[PDB]
Each structure stands twice: as structure tokens, then as C-alpha cells.
């Protein structure tokens, strides 16, 4: 899987509260995080299926 799948979730410097999904490689599951609204990194998806299709397995 892509090396960005191993990156921690990045809230970023903006102050919105956008609920997003990140792949948590330690758990092997897509989990939600609060995205600030600007300067999104790659481990930042709008849906669990996208997260999982991109970075999982089982």
C-alpha cells in the first residue's frame, strides 16, 4: 500500500471542523478525524470505502 497510508491524520492550520476519514495503519481500519478545511494531506478521504479501497486490505 501507498506510503501515505502510513501517515498520521493532518488537521492543518485552518479552523473549520470537517469530519473526514483517514486509514489508521496501526488499527487497519478507516477512522474519522477533524479536518481544519485547508491543506489536506493524502490520508484524507470523504468516505470509508475510498479509504479502504485505497489503503486497506483486512
Secondary-structure map:
Blueprint: E1 18-24, E2 29-35, H1 48-55
Antiparallel strand pairs: 1-2
Structure, explained:
- Strands 1-2 form a two-stranded antiparallel sheet.
- A hairpin with a 4-residue loop joins strand 1 and strand 2.
- It has a single domain, classed as Pancreatic trypsin inhibitor Kunitz domain (Factor Xa Inhibitor), CATH 4.10.410.10.
- The chain is elongated and about 35 Å long.
- 14% of the residues lie in helices and 24% in strands.
- It contains 1 helix and 2 strands, in the order ββα.
- With 58 residues, the chain is of the alpha+beta class.
- GO terms for molecular function: calcium ion binding; molecular function inhibitor activity; potassium channel inhibitor activity; protease binding; serine-type endopeptidase inhibitor activity; sulfate binding; zymogen binding.
- It is found in: Secreted.
- Inhibits trypsin, kallikrein, chymotrypsin, and plasmin.
- One of its GO terms (cellular component) is extracellular space.
